[PDB]
Amino acid sequence: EVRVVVDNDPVPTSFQKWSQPGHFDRTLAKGAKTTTWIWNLHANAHDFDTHTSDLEDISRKIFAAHFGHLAVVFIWLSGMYFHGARFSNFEAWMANPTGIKPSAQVVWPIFGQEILNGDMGGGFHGIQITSGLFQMWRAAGFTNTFQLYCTAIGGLVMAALMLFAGWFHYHKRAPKLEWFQNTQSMLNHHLAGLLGLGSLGWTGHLIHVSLPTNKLLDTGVALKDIPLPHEFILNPSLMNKLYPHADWGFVKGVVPFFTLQWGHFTDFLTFKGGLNPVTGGLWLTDVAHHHLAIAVMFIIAGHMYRTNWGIGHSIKEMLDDARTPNMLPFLSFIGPVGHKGLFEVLTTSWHAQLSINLAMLGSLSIIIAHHMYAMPPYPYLATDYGTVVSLFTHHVWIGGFLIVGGAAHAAIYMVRDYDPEQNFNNVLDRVLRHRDAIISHLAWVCQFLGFHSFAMYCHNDTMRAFGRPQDMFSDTGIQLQPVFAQWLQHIHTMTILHDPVSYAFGGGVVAVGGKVAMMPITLGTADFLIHHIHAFTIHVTVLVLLKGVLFARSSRLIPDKANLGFRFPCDGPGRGGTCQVSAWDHVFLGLFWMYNSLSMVIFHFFWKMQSDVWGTVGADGVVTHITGGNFATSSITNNGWLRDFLWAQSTQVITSYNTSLSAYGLMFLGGHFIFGFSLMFLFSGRGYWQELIESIVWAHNKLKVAPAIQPRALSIIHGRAVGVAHYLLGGIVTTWAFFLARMTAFG
Amino acid sequence: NTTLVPCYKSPAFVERMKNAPDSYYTTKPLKAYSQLLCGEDGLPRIALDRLSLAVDVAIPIAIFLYTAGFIGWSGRSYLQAIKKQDKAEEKEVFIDVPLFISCMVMALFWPMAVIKELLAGELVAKDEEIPISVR
Amino acid sequence: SHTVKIYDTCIGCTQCVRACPTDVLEMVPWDGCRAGQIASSPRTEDCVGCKRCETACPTDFLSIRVYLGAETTRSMGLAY
Amino acid sequence: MAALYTHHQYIAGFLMVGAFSHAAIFWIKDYDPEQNKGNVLERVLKHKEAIIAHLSWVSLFLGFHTLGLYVHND
Amino acid sequence: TLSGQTPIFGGSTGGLLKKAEVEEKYAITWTSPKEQVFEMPTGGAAIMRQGQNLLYLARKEQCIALGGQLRKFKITDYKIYRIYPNGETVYIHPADGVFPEKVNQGREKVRYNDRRIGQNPSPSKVKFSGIATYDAPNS
Amino acid sequence: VQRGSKVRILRPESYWFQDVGTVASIEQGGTSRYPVIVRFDKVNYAGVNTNNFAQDELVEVE
Amino acid sequence: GPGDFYVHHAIALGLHVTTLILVKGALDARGSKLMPDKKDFGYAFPCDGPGRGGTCDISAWDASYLAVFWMLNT
Amino acid sequence: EARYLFRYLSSAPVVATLALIIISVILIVLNYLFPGLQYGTFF
Ligand code: CLA
Ligand code: CLA
Ligand code: CLA
Ligand SMILES: CC1=C(C/C=C(\C)CCC[C@H](C)CCC[C@H](C)CCCC(C)C)C(=O)c2ccccc2C1=O
Ligand code: SF4
Ligand code: SF4
Description:
This is part of a larger assembly, with 8 protein chains of 7 kinds. Chain B has 135 residues and is mainly alpha-helical. Chain B is built from 7 helices and 2 strands, in the order E-H-H-E-H-H-H-H-H. Chain D is an all-alpha fold. In chain D, 76% of the residues lie in helices and 0% in strands. Chain D has 4 helices and no strands. Chain D has helices at 2-29, 42-45, 48-64, 67-73. In chain D, 14% of the residues are buried. The chains are: A mainly alpha (747), B mainly alpha (135), C mainly beta (80), D mainly alpha (74), E alpha+beta (139), F mainly beta (62), H mainly alpha (43). Chain C binds chain E through residues 3-9, 14, 17-18, 21-23, 25-30, 35-38, 40-44, 46, 48, 61-63, 65, 67, 73-74, 77-80, and chain E through 16-20, 23-24, 58-62, 64-65, 92-94, 100-103, 105, 107-118, 132, 134. One iron/sulfur cluster binds at residues 4, 19-22, 24-25, 47-53, 66 of chain C.
């Protein structure tokens, strides 16, 4: 039975525990002896699996903390709509989305920092935003700043709604454990009720607000003549000169949908498959049709799993039937148990669920980044070159942090929530029973690719210096063509309906006005060599993270590693030395390798777009790119990455003093600080530093100013966590300040 | 004595006042920099002379070093207050602000309060009461 | 082949013996404690060097040391 | 002229790190407090937490006002 | 010597290597009143039998990490052997039959210094001598 | 050196060298060689504040 | 000029920190409160385990080592 | 109980985050004091 059970008032509501920090752990509540109590109070505040032991009381803390998180997104989402309401040039940008630059977030007149208020066109002085908010509100049908303001008001009352529901579901009506454990019913309402009714609600907005507004904005009605979006429903004769093949009446226009004469909708539900050549984005008839085929497919697929009416699938039976009397005979190697005892894994532990939901949301956010540049979805997005790169670079970094989190909680599951009772000889036992064959062949293909992607950049670097340009892996020397990726560019242009979907594959140059939106991205030897840099760096990022998941239980070094914990520094200087043997220090080492992997994805993007896609078109048809075919000849030596990319494209962030890009020149140099500052914590150890506090504590005990919270150096784990939190901060903000000073000096 | 001419007759500083914006940052703070010594590139230097900049250099000393030893003396007299109450482990996290303000207005006259503990020998702790290492 | 010496500041709380992963230490009878015990290390050839007995000793400036010396095949934990 | 300045300053930085590397090997391996009783070599260890507490003030002074005076000028 | 039935284990990869055939190899031996499942020190999970069990491990830290696991299954009767490749089975844990946590008599104060730890001699006392500073026969 | 008295430490190898501590218990057996257990108000290094001491390395302050 | 005032305080910051690491390496080569028997362990040892908070880089070799990063920097 | 609320607002991160908004008086002493105030230009 799939009934609802709650608990009436389980937790009191008082400020008595706010006066006692560290109440959740028993060793933190007994007092603050040293300053390690300060740091342990924040490293354990959200470890809800160590505050209590029962999954009924843990899962109420999980459910009530999502509500307080959703009430934090709604504060930030009401700050993007409020800044577009009061502190922006959204009026001047909507009239002319080519000459006027998108800007919110004006700067106060103090400390001489009003030099950052550069000229945005039309007498507006502010900071050129690269978040794509202006190109997104135009696609939603926003026309005046009153509609942006009462979205920001409507989100603040949606933040107080989501914040009241976290107090209500922890202090008044907290659910029970058998309400959280019916994950078949949860998948019915998230597929159909959330992803199906969300893309059914949005395709009703598109054809009633976005499709009328973006039709009249292409005729240039100049924001007096355009109607407010309720006047396309209250006045249905107004949407009849647009889209005349339908009827557009309250009851008279819907009946082509029920009588299945869907040819009445074929003018505003198209399958054109291309870019709008006036704006640059996709057709909003093509997008509104897309959400209708998504809402059908999701509401259908939300009736797959069995709730209390008998009919439906059950994941408990589908998982337990994949044993090996019934498999395909070439993948019948996975156990006579199969993966019985695996529905008990993803229901009785939240870390097992978090490791899949982070690696899927991480890999989704990189698929999203690869699609919003090749199929640009918003009007005037693709020609705002500062927005195209800052949305690819954003969701690649966001979607790569979540991958490392998907491999952190796949290691907290093994140390804490793994049970050898329910996992005997199933599909997870059999992986730990051969984990020196997974890691041996992973550490070979990381080694095979490191020689065949990086040492081919050292072969080209030596032939170019020798004066032998015919001996190196060029398009002019020893050609390495992407034979299987030049062929898929041939398939996706020979299967066109009549318009060539995704001009990145081939055919046509979308050059909507001034600058060029999309062009074919051809692939040569410089694209063969750089896709194997990506294949190499992804595999070592996997090898570091997979070694921390398989060897989180035990090893040949420390066979009792799951008793030392997940987050422990070492097991002493024995066995030669066993520092960073934990599963935490493979998340820590996979964060540098996520960094090195994703910083070359955003450098391959930023240079291939400038040299082979972006640029300006004249009055003949030839395109002069931003760097001018530079990736084909000089991105094959990593002296060419040093000279033609890092040195030659940072002339906009170096010479950005006394101008309006002045903060990008400071964040560039403030970024190099935090990277070099990170190396104090990474390279040194805490026994130097604890033995240095003791000589400084002495100078306070001498002058009688010693504290009773006794000053201790940071932990071994805490000293490694702040050495990677600074490397991955000052290494990102120096790339953020270079990607944006280069592209907001052009546009 | 040096080549640091004042910014009144420096021939490279008057161009910084010739072509300039107005708002609040390059008009009134620029004519107040005119009595400052500046080199051959029109940038107001900070030299140390005998009497012409005797108190002109001693205002940033005496203004800072008072409220350097005002933060330090109210932090020292607060840590000594909460250790005679025998509750210093818990009063350092939860700051007892009626006492920290009381130990702040006792530090407003700290130069005539430090030397009342130097001659009384109570500023420093004696070497046989301070924890050390094996030396 | 490390060197696990044991000094007379012991209190016989047996905590180093429970923390040893290789059974190097063991409790022998003594006269200078209330437990009447002191640790001894007869199987110091099995000392893996990991100093886990040193983190468990509660006497200040602990009564047991591991002096990391000439390492061998069983003092380095090599299963290959 | 440029490669001979940078040569002899990196040699002189290495030779001064090694002048203090063998100070540390002298204290460990070659010093006994019984023979050096009451002399000038025991008096340094008698207050060695006042030299390290004052080298760490000059270090803390010269970096709060040299980095801070650059990134004010920056 | 040693005997017993091996637990139901479907083979692993973290098991014995060429060191176990050539240098030394360890064997833990316990008995179980139940058909329960335990975690292997070589990765995975195995079902121990109901009679005398016998499991060959590669080093001594794997046996006592397993011996510390059986003590949580309320099985405190395990014997650890050490098998040289010529067949010589010595018996090493627990040596006297009694566990090393609780005290027995006849055992010796071996590797014991009769001083405080802080009054070890300086390394200039033992200069160009065979002994180390922690051997130090004075006190 | 009685129970409850404040005492200073003359053990150079210890953490609490020249630190005032409160005596917790003294052993009356006479064969344990570290009878007096003194409790300190600051922990040493992630751990204890009590330690067994001798009587020749302890100087009382009151 | 004033560009030379500022670098001589970076040079002075450089010579004082790399003296601080080397003097603390030489004077705490006998031992301090984190481990009072550094002489019994030699010059170059890794650590003394994760006990007492953790003692990475505690030796006098590992303070003649962090001051090569400061010698090369200065 | 609102008598344990201000016993939480007197804790360490609260009074040392209001020890930075009270050091927004360097914002007001550099707003109307024609912000440029060098080391010789104030008395
Ligand atoms: C950046 C700092 C710096 C600079 C500018 C120099 C500059 C110089 N060095 Mg060098 N050197 C340095 C640091 C530096 N040194 C340090 C820290 C060491 C100690 C390891 C050395 C040790 C050294 C030696 C032994 C020699 C020099 C020599 C020279 C001179 C000729 C080389 C040349 O043309 O420039 C080129 C650019 C360079 C960076 C020079 C690199 C020379 C390396 C450091 C030699 C190191 C030897 C190596 C460790 C052993 C290799 C043995 C085997 C594998 C073959 C030149 C003036 C040569 C000389 O004395 O002229 C007659 C010479 O014999 N130096
Ligand atoms: C640029 C510096 C650098 C280099 C060259 C490497 C190289 C390597 N890393 Mg490393 N790493 C680095 C920085 C570097 N890393 C940093 C800064 C971190 C900090 C977090 C790490 C952390 C890290 C981890 C955690 C791991 C590695 C691994 C590896 C190995 C990958 C296997 C491979 O690619 O085979 C190819 C070899 C190369 C790419 C090296 C260049 C080869 C040259 C060009 C050819 C040499 C020519 C010839 C043979 C020279 C001989 C001449 C003769 C006179 C001697 C590889 C040797 C992974 C591993 O173990 O792999 C199994 C591993 O897991 N690294
Ligand atoms: C007159 C000069 C002099 C002399 C006689 C010594 C003598 C000694 N030193 Mg020493 N030292 C010196 C200067 C000197 N040092 C300087 C200038 C420094 C600062 C860097 C040091 C820092 C230092 C440390 C930290 C230690 C010593 C140690 C020692 C003792 C043993 C040496 C050893 O380990 O074996 C032989 C040494 C080697 C075989 C060298 C190893 C490899 C080095 C790093 C060369 C690498 C260069 C590289 C390969 C070239 C690049 C090739 C090309 C690609 C460019 C020995 C008595 C050790 C000791 O006393 O132990 C108790 C010890 O720990 N020294
Ligand atoms: C520098 C460093 C330290 C020392 C780090 C310290 C001491 C942290 C510094 C944080 C300071 C102490 C912040 C404290 C701020 C105070 C609360 C004062 C603020 C009060 C005002 C706001 C009123 C380590 O402990 C360490 C450990 C392991 C590897 C590397 C390192 C390492 O590199
Ligand atoms: S070394 Fe530790 S466990 Fe052993 S007797 Fe001494 S205090 Fe007890
Ligand atoms: S080093 Fe390891 S095996 Fe040896 S006595 Fe210490 S804890 Fe036991």
